[PDB]
Design a protein around this motif. Structure first.
Motif, PDB file in Angstrom:
ATOM      1  N   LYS A   1       0.850  -1.171   0.000  1.00 34.67           N
ATOM      2  CA  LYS A   1       0.000   0.000   0.000  1.00 34.67           C
ATOM      3  C   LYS A   1       0.891   1.227   0.000  1.00 34.67           C
ATOM      4  N   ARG A   2       1.217   1.711  -1.200  1.00 36.92           N
ATOM      5  CA  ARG A   2       2.049   2.889  -1.373  1.00 36.92           C
ATOM      6  C   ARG A   2       1.393   4.104  -0.740  1.00 36.92           C
ATOM      7  N   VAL A   3       2.222   5.038  -0.294  1.00 40.43           N
ATOM      8  CA  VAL A   3       1.734   6.261   0.324  1.00 40.43           C
ATOM      9  C   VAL A   3       2.438   7.431  -0.338  1.00 40.43           C
TER      10      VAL A   3
ATOM     11  N   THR B   1       3.319  11.500  -0.533  1.00 40.11           N
ATOM     12  CA  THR B   1       3.490  12.657   0.337  1.00 40.11           C
ATOM     13  C   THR B   1       3.999  13.811  -0.504  1.00 40.11           C
TER      14      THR B   1
ATOM     15  N   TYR C   1       0.933  13.609   4.201  1.00 44.93           N
ATOM     16  CA  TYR C   1       1.056  12.670   3.094  1.00 44.93           C
ATOM     17  C   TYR C   1       0.180  13.183   1.954  1.00 44.93           C
TER      18      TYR C   1
ATOM     19  N   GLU D   1       0.159   7.849  -4.142  1.00 44.38           N
ATOM     20  CA  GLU D   1       1.016   6.800  -4.648  1.00 44.38           C
ATOM     21  C   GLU D   1       0.260   5.483  -4.605  1.00 44.38           C
TER      22      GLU D   1
ATOM     23  N   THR E   1      -6.207   1.024  11.843  1.00 43.87           N
ATOM     24  CA  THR E   1      -5.934   2.361  11.359  1.00 43.87           C
ATOM     25  C   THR E   1      -6.857   3.358  12.026  1.00 43.87           C
TER      26      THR E   1
ATOM     27  N   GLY F   1      -5.962   6.284   9.961  1.00 46.33           N
ATOM     28  CA  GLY F   1      -4.715   6.874   9.543  1.00 46.33           C
ATOM     29  C   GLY F   1      -4.861   8.344   9.241  1.00 46.33           C
TER      30      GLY F   1
ATOM     31  N   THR G   1       8.914   2.345   0.877  1.00 45.92           N
ATOM     32  CA  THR G   1       8.330   3.636   0.507  1.00 45.92           C
ATOM     33  C   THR G   1       8.720   4.810   1.401  1.00 45.92           C
TER      34      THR G   1
END
Ligand SMILES: Nc1ncnc2c1ncn2[C@@H]1O[C@H](COP(=O)(O)OP(=O)(O)OP(=O)(O)O)[C@@H](O)[C@H]1O
Ligand SMILES: Nc1ncnc2c1ncn2[C@@H]1O[C@H](COP(=O)(O)OP(=O)(O)O)[C@@H](O)[C@H]1O
Ligand SMILES: Nc1ncnc2c1ncn2[C@@H]1O[C@H](COP(=O)(O)OP(=O)(O)O)[C@@H](O)[C@H]1O
Lengths: 370, 75, 370, 370
Positions: free
Chosen positions: B50-52, B54, B71, B75, C147, C167, C346
């Motif tokens: 799960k790309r993030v 920012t 963020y 992505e 989350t 989140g 990442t």
């Protein structure tokens, strides 16, 4: 009217309600001889209470049930109390209520043991026990103040703001002049003044009261005193021995300023009091800066207020002015504070009677503490 | 031992090291806890892919355009 | 750098360490900075005078143990640096800052100065290539997989609730209190002095912690269980010596909900969490109710959570179902969550390069962080 | 000087010496100042009085022997000088102070004045270019190999029980008693006088000390064997005179632990050791119980260690494993450790040179002493 009985960690003091001079001014120390194969000397006591022990101090084993105030054998001090009555006032404790002393952070079992002695043993009509610092501030005439209480067995700074309970900053500290006397006779032993028993300790604690003072710059004063041969003053003792003390006089109280000498894992008295200060509201601590109540008879020292003052002054801001409250009679202001405290209207109702105790057991000590 | 031999005053029969013959959690056990492992590699590989995105997630006393969000990019 | 990232479980009282690729921290130890309280002349003692690990974990009555993270906030950073060097040492990692990605922990709304000072260390003294340090709440979120939720991360000497749904941060609802279990242990030695036990040392405080982590719990009824008769469980010393307990073991963490005993105003962090609930959205609350995050080793008490469930019943409305999320090894749970976070590839934008520190430093810290 | 250092097995009652590399102090002899029993004004008497060894071991009913160091307190400085010259002679040293390094050993409770005066003689009359003053417990630990330990000594009157872990200089852990077999034998001969056996001269009492070191023990059931009817085994003097001993053979030494009828109500070092235990901490105490070292010469007794084992067993609580290391050469253990210290390279830097003594003196003694 009542019985204002002070329990000094070293000596003792007592009297009725409203009495001005302390009657039982005698050593609150226990002593017994070397009960051995020899017989009695024309018939005499077994235990030797204070002045009796002080008299024949060469053999009477000067002991204490007191452990920095913590009495282990209550039988000792209670027989001392009986004789103290029948010594000073010759009054029974059943006709007049009693007033006693205490120090914070004391196990309640001590005071409850005390209590049951007064009721089961002494049969006092009423009774009460309070902190010595309260009597000190009482003698000062205030209600707001950091009462740095300092007995010769314990020490406890008492920050107060209009007679209110602030025990989180109030901290008991088993700092005795006896501890200083321990270290003192030790350093004397390496100075050729090698002595062991407690009789030696009595003489040198009196010598401590004679010439042991508080300097201002311990290391600088130490170097100068090392150079000041005239400062190493002498005194031919009761025995043929003489002394020599120039450093020792102020070298010994630095252990209070520096626990390092004893490895107490604590802070020096000045900043210890300041640590107790740090546990409050700084703006009411301003008043406490003005309320520099230096109390406890173990503060009767030459050059101590300026020392302590200057130390905490260096710790304090410039605007935070230290204003010492320290009458030389603070030693007596404990018992005299209790003596005049007995004359308080509300206090003549604030009591712990016979049935009040019996019908509550030792549990009443908690709410009837202060 | 040779020192013991050469020294006369030194006696023997001494059990030198004289000694005393001495002879020789609940919170998880509650009515309501559920102590569970997230299976670190399982949940890790799960959220790992799960790309993030920012883009200058900057907030400390930064004034301009009242609402902010960390963020920022995708992505 | 393309190396294994250093996963440090820097908790205020328990600062563990390890790497990401490892699901178990191999370098676990609490907060402690010991300095030898004794002189040593004869050979036989090792030196360094700042002992971490075995020396500190054996010679407790010899080293003046310091807990430099005052409420998780350290000012004697130098000591921490040496502890980090101890981590770089042979006993823990045998590596360098430059050689590995690093990961430490954080508390919410810390003084910026601490973050700046830490970055000074890790990017000036230590020279980590890429590094980022964040809240322990995210680590716990990885430890739960959740989350949504109010991360109740309440460690050794800090108690904080972190409300974050899916989140998404909500700092106005996010609260933090710099006091926890460390103070209950402080209160435990307060109990010791209540019944006369002058175990003032930090090692003595560790003994206190041993009782805290050995014989202490939470009786769900306050006065109904406090006013009863106690058996006074005889605890066994580091000599195995018998010492009774009293109601103390369960009434000690009560202070966490009534800070008035220590002379403090608060509500009991769970009520602060209820305030955060009130600061949140009506039906979105219920989810967070079910998000009972349990963090910080101080939560280890029998009936602890159930007492808090009783608190919920006293304060939350009906059927707003709460669901305990307990962690197995709560302390490792944080570390393992950090292992997950550090193992994120990442992390590019999420980390902070060393040159970035060279560009702005403090401004870039607080800039890039929240 | 770069020569073989003089390893000295010092002492108030027994002072021996040898060198490094030697496994034994080459000339074993006790501490004594042998003067005649007659007026040495008329010619042809025992003048000079430098009677050490065979000269003292020659005249028996003609020598009134003296003892300089009395519990670490030496007053017969000039007598020590002539005893030194006897040693410096070719019967014991065969070399000079300038020609060989010298090592001095001490114990606690030693005033600085003794050290200063002895160093004056050793650096002015005699001139050691490489001289160092040290302790004795350190040397006993060197002999045992241990560094962690409750070291005890049983000298002539030298008895220090200081728990020293890993060579840690812990002066607050000092627990030194200044009495042993000396006065024990003095009142044991008083018992002999109680049954008609007068020993007033030194040599007359030295025979009694030979009995003390020969026919004297510790009946592990002191009051039981005391209540048990004795048999009084007959001793035979150098004169061969029949002398029964019986209860007194163990009375006066058992009286060390039970000083009941002395007047000097001493302790019996186990009590003093429990006080030292209190000085230490349970985590260290538990270890130091197993770490107990004995030294001196008064340890030499039948049922000695086992009686003291029983004593501490009655003192120590349960689950307290105590181990008391005590070889056979407790006297030589000091000398053995002196040779070990002589083999140390730090010790070379630890010693004070003659020039260094000329520069400071007393300050160099008490500063470079450790
Ligand atoms: N002139 C003096 N110089 C030095 N010290 C003095 C002098 N006068 C009194 N003191 C100190 O006063 C102490 C005794 O006073 P104090 O009132 O503390 O006795 P106490 O028995 O502790 O009484 P309480 O327990 O009621 O406080 C001694 O330890 C001594 O150090
Ligand atoms: N059984 C227990 N009872 C009370 N407190 C505990 C217990 N076990 C651990 N703790 C406290 O919790 C701390 C560990 O929690 P942690 O989250 O690591 O604190 P921090 O993060 O502040 O170091 C320990 O330092 C200890 O003080
Ligand atoms: N068998 C024994 N019984 C009793 N006492 C002894 C025995 N052997 C030696 N001693 C005592 O111990 C002393 C020797 O121990 P040491 O440590 O050399 O004494 P010091 O240090 O006072 O000279 C002797 O002077 C004697 O008093």
């Amino acid at each position: 009217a009542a019985l204002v009985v002070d329990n000094g960690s070293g000596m003792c003091k007592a009297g009725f309600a409203g009495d001005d001079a302390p009657r039982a001014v005698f050593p609150s120390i226990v002593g017994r001889p070397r009960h051995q194969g020899v017989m009695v000397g024309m018939g005499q006591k077994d235990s030797y209470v204070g002045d009796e022990a002080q008299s024949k101090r060469g053999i009477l084993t000067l002991k204490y049930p007191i452990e920095h105030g913590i009495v282990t054998n209550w039988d000792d001090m209670e027989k001392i109390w009986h004789h103290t009555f029948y010594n000073e006032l010759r009054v029974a404790p059943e006709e007049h209520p009693v007033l006693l002393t205490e120090a914070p952070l004391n196990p309640k079992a001590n005071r409850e043991k005390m209590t049951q002695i007064m009721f089961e043993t002494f049969n006092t009509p009423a009774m009460y026990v309070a902190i010595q610092a309260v009597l000190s501030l009482y003698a000062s005439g205030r209600t707001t103040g950091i009462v740095m209480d300092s007995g010769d067995g314990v020490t406890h700074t008492v920050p107060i703001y209009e007679g209110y309970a602030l025990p989180h900053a109030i901290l008991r500290l088993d700092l005795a002049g006896r501890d200083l006397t321990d270290y003192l006779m030790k350093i004397l032993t390496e100075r050729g003044y090698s002595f062991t028993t407690t009789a030696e300790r009595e003489i040198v604690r009196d010598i401590k009261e004679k010439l042991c003072y508080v300097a201002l710059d311990f290391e600088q004063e130490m170097a100068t005193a090392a150079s000041s041969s005239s400062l190493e003053k002498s005194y031919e003792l009761p025995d043929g021995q003489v002394i020599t003390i120039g450093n020792e006089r102020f070298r010994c109280p630095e252990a209070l300023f520096q626990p390092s000498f004893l490895g107490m894992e604590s802070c020096g008295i000045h900043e210890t009091t300041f640590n107790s200060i740090m546990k409050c509201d700084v703006d009411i601590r301003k008043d406490l800066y003005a309320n520099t109540v230096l109390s406890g008879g173990t503060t009767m020292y030459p050059g101590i207020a300026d020392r302590m003052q200057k130390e905490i002054t260096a710790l304090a801001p410039s605007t935070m002015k230290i204003k010492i409250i320290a009458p030389p009679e603070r030693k007596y202001s404990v018992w005299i504070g209790g003596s005049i405290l007995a004359s308080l209207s509300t206090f003549q109702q604030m009591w712990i009677s016979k049935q009040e105790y019996d019908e509550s057991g030792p549990s009443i000590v908690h709410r009837k503490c202060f | 031992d040779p020192k013991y031999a050469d020294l006369p005053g030194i006696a023997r029969n001494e059990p030198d090291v004289y000694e005393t013959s001495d002879l020789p959690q609940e919170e998880l056990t509650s009515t309501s806890v559920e102590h569970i492992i997230v299976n670190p590699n399982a949940a890790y590989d799960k959220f790992k892919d799960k790309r993030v995105g920012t883009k200058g997630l900057d907030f400390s006393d930064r004034i301009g355009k009242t609402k902010r969000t960390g963020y920022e990019s995708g992505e | 750098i393309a190396n294994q990232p250093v996963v440090i479980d820097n908790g205020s009282g328990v600062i563990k360490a390890g790497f990401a690729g490892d699901q178990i921290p191999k370098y676990c130890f609490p907060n402690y900075v010991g300095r030898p309280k004794h002189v040593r002349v004869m050979a036989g003692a090792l030196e360094g005078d700042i002992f971490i690990g075995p020396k500190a974990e054996e010679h407790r009555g010899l080293l003046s143990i310091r807990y430099p993270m005052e409420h998780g906030i350290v000012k004697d950073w130098n000591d921490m640096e040496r502890i980090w060097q101890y981590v770089y040492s042979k006993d823990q990692l045998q590596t360098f800052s430059e050689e590995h990605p690093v990961l430490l922990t954080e508390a919410p709304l810390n003084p910026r100065k601490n973050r700046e000072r830490a970055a000074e260390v890790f990017f000036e003294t230590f020279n980590v290539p890429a590094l980022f340090i964040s809240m322990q709440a995210v680590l716990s979120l990885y430890a739960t997989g959740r989350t949504t939720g109010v991360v109740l991360d309440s460690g050794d000497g800090v108690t904080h609730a972190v409300p974050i749904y899916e989140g998404f941060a909500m700092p106005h609802s996010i609260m933090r209190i710099d006091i926890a279990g460390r103070d209950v242990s402080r209160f435990l030695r307060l109990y010791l002095r209540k019944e006369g036990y002058d175990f003032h040392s930090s090692s003595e405080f560790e003994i206190v912690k041993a009782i805290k982590e050995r014989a202490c719990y939470l009786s769900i009824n306050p006065q109904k269980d406090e006013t009863l008769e106690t058996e006074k469980a005889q605890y066994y010393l580091p000599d195995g010596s018998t010492i009774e307990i009293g109601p103390s073991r369960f009434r000690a963490p009560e202070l966490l909900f009534r800070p008035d005993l220590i002379g403090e105003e608060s509500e009991g962090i769970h009520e602060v969490l209820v305030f955060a609930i009130q600061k949140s959205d009506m039906d979105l609350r219920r989810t967070l109710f079910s998000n009972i995050v349990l963090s910080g080793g101080s939560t280890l008490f029998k009936g602890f959570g159930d007492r808090l469930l009783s608190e919920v019943k006293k304060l939350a409305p009906k059927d707003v179902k709460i669901r305990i999320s307990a962690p197995q090894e709560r302390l490792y749970s944080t570390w393992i969550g950090g292992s997950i976070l550090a193992s994120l590839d990442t992390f590019k934008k999420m980390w902070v390069s060393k040159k970035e520190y060279e560009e702005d430093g403090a401004r870039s810290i607080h800039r890039k962080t929240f």
